[PDB]
Every structure is written in C-alpha cells, then in structure tokens.
Amino acid sequence: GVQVETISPGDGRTFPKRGQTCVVHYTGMLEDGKKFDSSRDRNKPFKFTLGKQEVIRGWEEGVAQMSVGQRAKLIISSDYAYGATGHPGIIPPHATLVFDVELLKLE
Amino acid sequence: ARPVTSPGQHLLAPEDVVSCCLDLSVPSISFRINGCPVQGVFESFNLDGLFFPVVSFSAGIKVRFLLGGRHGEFKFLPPPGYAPCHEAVLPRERLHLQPIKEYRREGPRGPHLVGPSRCLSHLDFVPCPVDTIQIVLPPHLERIREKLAENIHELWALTRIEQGWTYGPVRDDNKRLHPCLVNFHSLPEPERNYNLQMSGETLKTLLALGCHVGMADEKAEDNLKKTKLPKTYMMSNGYKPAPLDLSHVRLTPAQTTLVDRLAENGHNVWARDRVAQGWSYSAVQDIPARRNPRLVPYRLLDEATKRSNRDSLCQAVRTLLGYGYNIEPPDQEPSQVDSQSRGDRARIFRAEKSYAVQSGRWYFEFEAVTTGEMRVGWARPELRPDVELGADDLAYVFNGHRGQRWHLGSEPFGRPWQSGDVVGCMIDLTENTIIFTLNGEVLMSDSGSETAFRDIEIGDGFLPVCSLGPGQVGHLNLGQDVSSLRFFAICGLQEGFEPFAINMQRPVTTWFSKSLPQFEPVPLEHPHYEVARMDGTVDTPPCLRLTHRTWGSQNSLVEMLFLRLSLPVQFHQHFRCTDNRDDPEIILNTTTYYYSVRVFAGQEPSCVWVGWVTPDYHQHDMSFDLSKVRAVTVTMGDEQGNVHSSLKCSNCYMVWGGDFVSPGQQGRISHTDLVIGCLVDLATGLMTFTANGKESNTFFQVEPNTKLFPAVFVLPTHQNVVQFELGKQKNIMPLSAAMFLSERKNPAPQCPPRLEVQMLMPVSWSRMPNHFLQVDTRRAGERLGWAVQCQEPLMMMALHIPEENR
Amino acid sequence: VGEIFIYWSKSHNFKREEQNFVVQNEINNMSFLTYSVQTSLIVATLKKMLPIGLNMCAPTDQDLIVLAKARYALKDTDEEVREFLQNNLNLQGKVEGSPSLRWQMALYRGVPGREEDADDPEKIVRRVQEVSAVLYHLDQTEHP
Amino acid sequence: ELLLQTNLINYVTSIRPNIFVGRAEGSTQYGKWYFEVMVDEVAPFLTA
C-alpha cells in the first residue's frame, strides 16, 4: 500500500481522474534515505496519464489521492513499488520507496 | 527527523509564526505553530553550556526574529512564567544577529580570516566570592568596622543628594526620593544590618585577600575631619550625610589593583545573597518579579557600574589607609588559565598543497586587524594541524604579538605590530632565505641580520600560512590584484619578488585546521600507541591489542584515548514484531552478535569505558565520564497529552569498567583481566553487556537502521591497555558476520584487513569554500524585529562515505 | 652614491684606506646600520639607495640592462656602452613576449610621472648605462 | 555502500541573536525563556 502525508496544502478540490495527464515534480529516495531519482535534477516535470499503468502502483494510487498544487510524501511498500525483482542496478530487491511529489498541474 | 502532529501540518511557509519555549528546569523545549501547540517535545538533554535561539536555512528565505520589548513584538502571549528573550542580553553587549563559529568574514579590502571566538560558560554566571566567615576581625580593625558601616552611609548620602535624591517618606521614581535615605540609626535596622555587616565584611575580605593591616599610628586614626553638609544636601528628613574627609591618603598600582579585587568580592557576595533570596538577571529591571539588571558576576558587569563600585571601595580603602592602618597588597601567586589546548586552539590557514613553490622569489602580505597572537610565514606541504605554527621544522613564521621568529622554537626578532600593520613575507628560493617586513621596513634580528631564516632546504616547496589565536582577525593578501598590495612597491618589487598569486586567473584555495574531532586509523609510527593484530588460535579468537610504547619512561604521554573499530554494525530496517557446541539451526537463524574487550591486569578498570558509538561522536573530552554523553528524549503525544512515544537518542552506548570492580578489590590493583562482552540484537534493537560472564544491569534500545561502531575509551595506566576480541559465544554470531555480507552465515570469527583500530584526532585539515552564502541581517524596526535574508543560491558537489555516514 | 661606489670598487688604495680606518678607529658599522666588505659603509649605502635607481628604469629596459652589464664585463667605457645602447635600442624587452612584464608595466604606468618619462631615447641610453654599471660592480663586489 | 557517492547539495548557514541562557547551581540566570520567528518569504525549490 501507499501512505500519503501532506507537506504543503493544495487547492483541495481538483483531484486527478482516470485518463488525465498529471504533471509532477518528484524526488525519490530509498527507505534508508538514499536518493535514486529526481525530476528536478533534469529540470523537466514528469508527465504521466492516470490509468494507463505507466507508473508503479504506489504512484498510481498516491498521486490520485492528491490535489492540484499539493506537495506530499508517498511511502510505498515493495509489493506496490517493484516487489522482489526490484530495478536492476537502481533499486534493491524488496525495497520501500519514499517519494516527495508535487502535483504542478493537470492536463 | 521525527514527524510531529499539529493542526494543519505544513512545511514552514510565508506568514508562519513559530514560537519556541525553553524551560531549563525540566529541561524541556516546546514549540507552537501559529499559536497551535506542536504535539512533541525535547527533554532530558545535556545542560553543560549556554543555549541560544537559532535559525538554520539555505538560500531563498526571509525571516524575522521576534524577541519582545523593542526587538520584535510577539504575535502570541508567552506562556505563564516564560521571559522574553530580549531580557537575556548581557550588560556589556548590544543585541544583534550574528553567525556562529565563523572562520571568515567580509571586510573593507577583502575577506578577513577570523580565529576562534572565546565563549562564556554556564558556570560564568555563578558568583564565587572568597569565604569571609572563618575570618575574625583584629581588635583594631573591629574599632574602625563600626565607623565603616555608618561613615560609608554618610558618603553615600552626600552622593545621593548629589544624585538629586532627597529622603522620601515613600520611595518614588519620579520623586528620586529614598525611604532608605536617612541616618544609619534612622534607616530600618534590617537594611542597616546589611550595611554594618558589609563594612565588617570588607575588613574580613582583606584578611582573606591576605593583605595585612595594622595601624602604624593610632593618633592619626583619631584625627578625623568629616566634610560638612550643605542645606540643599540635607534630605527632606533633614539628615545630613557626613562622610569622614581624608584628602591626604594616596594609592599605589598594587594598592589600586587590590581595591579592584575588593570591589569584585563585594559585588559577588551581594549577588550570591540575592540569588539565594531568589533574584535573577534581566536587562530590564522588575522589582516585583525580583529581576535586576546588575545581578551578574562582577566580571560581566558594564564599565560604568564597575567604576562606581571601584570608586566606593577606593574611598573606603583610603579611609583605612589614612587612619594609619597599613594596607600591603597581598603577594601575587603565578596563575595559568590554559582555557583550551594550545596545540588545537589557534586556527591555521594555509594555501592548498598544489600551490607549493619550489623556486623563485615570492611575496605576500598579511594585515593584522587585531594585535594579538598571530603568526604568519611559510609552511611545508606536510604541515600538521594539531601543532603550533613554527613549533616544529615544518614552518618558518613570524609572530608579531611580541616579536618572534618561530622555527623549531622561538627566538626574539623584529618588533610588535599594531592594529592595521601589514607584514610582508618574502621567500627567496635561490638564496634559500626568508624575509619579513613591517610596513615596508625589513625586520632585523638582534644581531642585525636582515634575513629571518637562511640555509633553508627547499624539499617539497613552501606555502603561505598564517595562524590566528582566539579572538584575532587578519587579512591575507596573496597578490592576485597587484594593485591591492600596500607595500609591495616599497619593498620587494625592485628586489625582484613576485606576488604569490600574480598570474592566477582564480583566487587561491585555502585550507584551515578544523577543530572537530574525527576518527582516523592509528598511525603505524605513532610514538606512544601501537596496535597488534593477533591471529586466532585454537582457544583464542582474533584480537586487536593496544600497547603503550613509552609507558613508565620519561616523556610518556598519558591522556584519555578514544578508540573505535573502522566498520559499523547496522540494525535491520524492520524490527521483529514484539557439549557447548552451537546448534546449527539456532546459530544460522540468530540475529544476535557479540564482541568482547579484555582489560589487562594492571590497567585500572575504573579508567575504561566499553561499548558502541554512532557515526556522529565527536567528543575529545580529556575528563570523560558517562555523565558527559550526549542524550535527549523526544516525546510525541496526542492533542490532549496522552504521550504516544518517547525515544531516547544518544551517540555513545557504553558501560563503565568501574561498575564491575568488586568493593573488596576496590582500592587494590587487581591481578586478573576483566573481560566485558557486548551483545547486540540487530533485529530488535536491544544492546546488553556482560562482565566476566555475569550479565550486567545496563541495557540500551536503539532504532532500526542505526549504525554502531565498537568503541573503547581508556586512560592508560599500564603498558598493556586493552584488547578488542572479535570472538563469539554459544549460539551467538561474531562481528564479522554482521559486518561483511559474504560472511553473513559464516560463524567462524574473522578480522579482515579492512577492520582496524581508529583513534579520535582533535584537529583535521578542511578545505574552505571558494564562495559563501551572502546573508543580510538588519533591524526591521521596533515592532517587526530582526530580519534575516538570503536570496542567492549556492550548491556544492558532495562526496559521501557510506559506512561513516559523512 | 653609485659613482662613489664605482670609484671604491675600481681603486685598491680606497679599499685599503677604508679597511684601515675602520679597524683603527674601531668604528662599528653595525651600530649605524641597525671590517668586512659586507659591513663597508660605501657598499651598504649603495645597496640601500639602489632601489631608487632600479625605479628609474622601466621593466622594458631590463634586457638592455643585461646587455650593458655584458659589455661592461667586456670592460668597455661609459661612452661605449652608451653608444651600443643608442644603436641597438631595438633589443628592448617586449610586453607581449611574457606576462610578467605586463603587470610590471601596469605598476610602472600606474606610478605617476613614470608613464610620462621613458619617451626620449637619450633618457634610456643614460639610465640603463648608469644602473647597469652600478649592478655590474655590485655583482663583482659580492662575488669572491 | 562500497563506492563513494556523490550529489549536489545546498549550502546551509545558521544565524543567532547574541542571547545565551543556561542553568547552574547558584546561577544568576532565569530559567524559562521564549521567542518567536516569523517567516516572510520562502522559495521551496530555489534549487533542485
């Protein structure tokens, strides 16, 4: 499962719905605090369509649980992120992922 | 970082007001966000120092300190009993915002290098007057004592009318009228008693001081001519101050010095009495609240009050001197403060090693903004950070405080500098000489030679170097902007010296000696300590034994030694929910690991601490004991109290070897080794200890993902000090199994080459950044407070050592 | 002062008389400064005034200074050295050649008056000759 | 955990008022203190 913890409030009403393209800025860390990904390092917001199984399940649920303009911490368990296989060379097997996501806009 | 609940939680954002409350009695630190309580507190933390408000930030922020009074009006009422922070500013200071532990600053002509800052201690606010009760006044002294109590009031009253004070039936600030203004008998007896006790006390104080008073002439004392009183001088009551008058008496520099000592003791006695009654210090007086602007130890008092007290005491000292009683300032006993360790106190700044020059004629300048302990000159690339500059063969420097040239010792040379003076340092690697100029004039030794040093072996080259003592400021100009040099043209240009950084397109990078203790491998050639790696035998595990090379002999070094092992054990991310041969299943499924320390017979167990440290232990405490260990409890509760969690955090988990010394054996050097075993359960966070098999009562609980290094703190008392034994117990794994992944299931004890003993070193070389955050601090107003601003971003590429979390 | 020092170096009776006088009168040269060639007041005063002389010559003339020292070592006269400087006044050090001369010339031109001078070749052939002679004789005096 | 890791990080600095309070047996200093900080501007992601 994915746990969502607000960091900064959003608008409070506009939530993503299936088929919409969420634009986000995120920083990913392993549970022990090691950074492994960040869209701000590439200076380009990450766009993904909700409901097309493009991102991990934890992301699919957590970002849907957020509102436009909101920043939140997502804690995702292994079964929701990558499971036993992991991401070879990036994420170890059975790893819990902590993300710092910000939903910039909806399109 | 521990999440803490509050209404509408959010990362600090514009228009947020954070209220911080510190209660030193518990002790406890609590917060409020926009007036709502933050459901979490710090408590039970160390109190061996002074606390200050602090804000830390990166670029892109603008905040304001609100301290109450005229220094920022609070948006919320302080909780009952808490005092505005502005009241804590000391008498001889002015409130302002400042950086912390800065080694560098901006200045009119460029960056200023700054030495360590002298700080106060929480014990500097404890008045410590000399004992004056066992003292018994001499009979002749007692005769003047009665006169002293009342006559002092007389001079006061004359000064009080001079202040415009007139007796007030009722005291009034507008009136400037004092109820306590009247005759000594007229004055209330309890207040009068404090006056009489004080006059006797001054005589006892002198006896404690050791100055000796006996009357050369009794007749001279009998002759008194107290000054008369004018009618305007007389108080509304009509009492006239009649201080006795003594124009003839004179002082001596020792006698004046003895009167300054007398004024200190009097004030300290008064301060101790008021503290006992329950008063405290406050920048703004509050009589109903028992807060006084003068309730500090005499040392921290402002100059005006010091002068007033000294005036009163010197008047009183003179009256005794004129009576005929002889005052002889007590002999002065040599004393040394040694506030800190000199080898690690002065901050050394050197150029980066890659700039070392091996030929040519080079010149640079050093302007002394202050006039204290500062050294400047040339150093070899292998200069050490924990040795005074020029105390060994690795640096040739000039000390302008008194005038000295330092290289393998001190010799007189040159003259002392003054504020603003520029010292020019020249190295000539063709003649192998070093020259120093002061404001363009070549400094000369006593023999008249114009070279401070000569016949210098080039070796690996030389770097510009300087050393600033506590509270010193210098300006190092290496000559990138040849126009900025102030005396290069006057002396050095024609002689053919080039500014050190003449054709460098970038400023020269500098390193400084950082006084943050760090663990480093024990040097293979350390003159006093030696580590031996013992292989495991048929009955002994692998060991790392420490021996004191120069024990017993002269020049032996005996001081606290902090040792750890180079590799940590890491607790699991998730903790478990809620013959004498090993049993295979048990030993293959256990999560408990073990290691022991053997303290050899002759090594005092009372001088040994065994246990673990975290990556952030940095205490080089020469008087270490378990009470000095950093600790703090973080307590998170519900919105109506109801504590939900209470976590204790520390960086040192150890047991004292003295806890295992039998009372009978106590006081006698034992003839048996003491083996202390440490057990850690990496899946539950529990840490336990045993002493010679018996389980001890000490136990610790840590959190998941914690990193612990095996550690031993010892004050050597023998040639064989201690021995890390990396063995195992029955059904318990050795440390190698926890440290190395490939050995996770190997129960055979091991000590691979990576595992070694490291000791705590007090100073290290650290690279100064080329650029620094530009912080603007000002006073926004009497209501807005003190503004802090930082807008320009600054980033660095960090290199992280994983096992050391650094 | 440089002319007096040149006479002192050239003559040998001068050195003998100076050494005698100092030894006989027990005059401590160190007393004035704060028996030996280093202690000789004649050379000490020249070495203390030398910077004022080196200040006369612009850095571009350092090459001509080396050249003039080279002939004077060939034992030529003042008129000779002046003539060679006058003729091959085109062997002056160039600025673009090395950066060192760049900052040296920066300082020199920054100093007022120095920028206005060094514009008449007679000035150069004179100053280089004088300073080169003094440096030559200083070199011999310091050398064994 | 074996190779040295790298990353770009922000420089951080600290600022304090010259206010120092502590406790000791027989000290002349009060025990309870209070202050506030108001945040005017904060750029959450001035850098990465």
Ligand SMILES: Nc1ncnc2c1ncn2[C@@H]1O[C@H](COP(=O)(O)OP(=O)(O)OP(=O)(O)O)[C@@H](O)[C@H]1O
């Ligand atoms: N800060 C102090 N340091 C030393 N002695 C003090 C101090 N304050 C008071 N005393 C002692 O108490 C006496 C007070 O007598 P005095 O009539 O001059 O003062 P007062 O008008 O009653 O003022 P106060 O309110 O300060 O006690 C002083 O003469 C001195 O003996």
